[model samples]
Target chain A: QPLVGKQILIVEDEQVFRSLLDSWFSSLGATTVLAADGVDALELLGGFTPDLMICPIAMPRMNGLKLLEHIRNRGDQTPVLVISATENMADIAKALRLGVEDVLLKPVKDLNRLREMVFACLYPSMFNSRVERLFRDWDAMVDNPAAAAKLLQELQPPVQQVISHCRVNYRQLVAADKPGLVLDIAALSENDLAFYCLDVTRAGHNGVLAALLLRALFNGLLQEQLAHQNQRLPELGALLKQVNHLLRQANLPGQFPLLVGYYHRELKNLILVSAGLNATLNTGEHQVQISNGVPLGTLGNAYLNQLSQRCDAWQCQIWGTGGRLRLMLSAE
Target chain B: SSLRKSVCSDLLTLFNSPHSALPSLLVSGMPEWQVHNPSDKHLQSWYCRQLRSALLFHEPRIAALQVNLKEAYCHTLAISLEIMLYHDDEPLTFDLVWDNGGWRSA
Candidate 1:
């Protein structure tokens, strides 16, 4: 009963395979909907919204890619698992670019592994109780306003770091009665570092709570990714995409514009991606424009490549270090 | 008995089943045909094409299928179908008339 009360849409051309999937999920207490191809799936989508959609790469009438494009274009962010037979990395990459959760090779040999992934998608907290506790804390914060702001301030990362003489300093300036910026940094190795800043575009209590919800989602995804990795940090672009996907899934109110950055200490390079935040990078010797696109919790499948830009950065409302990298975030 | 009478019962179920009436996951069913002007050549042609697509996809037993518009009146349509299934030497001719919210074998 792992997927109890969950609805899953299974789209496959082969009848035997489709029936197999339906049987598997149905036995687990999931209400399953089957479709022969993408066209039929699209038609069913007109009246059905499932928690997860399982699709194949090649289908008659409309292929998986076209269906993916159609849903994403209309801002439908339902988590999709592409269990395709094709080994073409190009198509797999395209599905990933469109924000699909995972792509598995067809004729899957491991039913247990597939079930585990499905559980992860439907109930992420099943493996991470810390995230469950964090959700509770967020809910508690909403009940008390004054303390909520203080909690948000305390959530900021350490102000200074001197890892391997790669000095990194972080600071934020909040205007009166506004939701302060929230960010976290994780140093994976002497050579690699990951950090992100969540900016609340709207003002007041609800806005602050929205930002907290986004922070909770970010933390959960980051935790999950890091747990799976053996001391290796998840790709900066991929992490942001997951955060966006989770935010869209929550379907929360207000706008949470995010700015995520990764620093390579050895190379002295900084990679930054912004979602609907207007920010500039200053390296003392040079100032670079940070690539900012549509914010999180909104429609559109803006890919990671489109959002990430390598900046060659220190300012007010910026994270800075001795004459090296500085991100200047605009407040408004 | 004529070839039309022999296949009337089988084809009747296909034409009468509405798209919405079928299961959500079903791949084969008639589309929700919205006919405004029964005599509009474009509409007739489009409906005929959709019916052909549905018949071919849903009923794999048929080796060849052809749908033709016979006549049209206010709120009703009359169509004929020429179907040839596998292992059959001759084609079966059937007629379907649309009335009272469903297609009826004539």
Candidate 2:
């Protein structure tokens, strides 16, 4: 779901590049720590144990290779990925010998490849994760409700665990007598657990949320079907189809905006998403402004839908938190 | 002439680096001209005419009638196109600098 709250440590001297990489990790729903140089990275190791470290090889005050050596000497088995601007074959060979998981040549122009490599290195398990389980269950459910129900029953323990841990009051939130309450809980949980459910359902996690929401809404309709004496089942079914259509319409793309960097120039009429902080500039009027959005889990879909409709063309800017910063452009 | 000398010095310093490639030239000097080949006479004449037009356009008070030669190279050519004028019937001379690869003016 959320990389199991995995933390990634980024070591780079360039401010722009580090922020860009940090934003990418944040978009993937991972917490990131930034180190301006190898020395700073070494200092960070005292408190936070990172799941992965991505570093540039030519950093000052100890290059990436030296840092890797130090970590290895300390018996830290965290996977390290090295990036270099130069095409030095000898350095590449040396990094490989020193137990670096991967070496990427810089200016990383292909983000997709970077993501794939990082994912491959960190979370290599093809099974056991929720994303895998979601897909399997989704496939079984298609044209086979009995099989789907059985799989959903099997998924209860893990799903219940997530709900309890998150302190999600599903019965109080969605009414216990309704079957749709189960689906509602599945739809609204954070990415880490959602990713797990998608793996189980054989669907992308974003789509899985919509699917679960739809299931819950339809279940609510079915329950109403039994209680209303004058209600025609076929007419109710037709109405539910319309409700499903409306839910699909309501399902916006779940792509989180990656903060890249601030605009060196002025911009106008910008909008952004992700429950993260964003800024804007109106150079014509010589004014600059910064604002914050509700974080993903803090807002319901209705609020999100309203937010999505309100703005367009957010200014490009860099954002920072207590320990780190990220650069991102306005959503297209 | 002074402008021509300064431009030549700047070009020489820039090209002195081992990383830089050499340059070429088509003309040199005030009222002076150079043709790369024997058949380039018309081209040289056209080139000098355009240079004269450009000089007068920038400095209308000057009337150039002669030229002085300078160095030529693969990436650049330097020349002082001397202007001849009479102030109150007293003769005077000044040079309009020109180059091919180093720098230029509109």
Residue A39 accuracy (lDDT) in model 1: 94
**Cα RMSD for predicted model 2:** 26.0
TM-score of 2: 0.33
Candidate 2, position B2, lDDT: 54
Q: Please provide, for model 1 over A1-332, each residue's C-alpha lDDT reduced to its tens digit, 9 standing for 90 to 100.
A: 33556788999888767766776566545689888889999999999788789998899999999999899998898878877656444564467668776665433343322332343233443223334255345455667776566766666556776643355666554443334556666554556566666655343564465555544444434444555568544565666655544443332334556677666555555667767565566655666665464665443343465333333233323321101123332111
Instruction: In model 1, state the lDDT of residue A214.
Output: 48
Candidate 2 interface RMSD value: 29.4
- How many clashing pairs in candidate 2? 47
- Pairs of colliding residues, candidate 1: A282-A313, A283-A313, A313-A325, A313-A326, A314-A326
Mark the regions of model 2 whose C-alpha exceeds 4 Å error after superposition. Answer: A108-113, A125-332, B1-106
Judge candidate 2 against the unseen true structure and give its global Cα lDDT, from 0 to 1: 0.40
On the 0 to 100 scale, the lDDT of residue A212 in model 1 is: 55
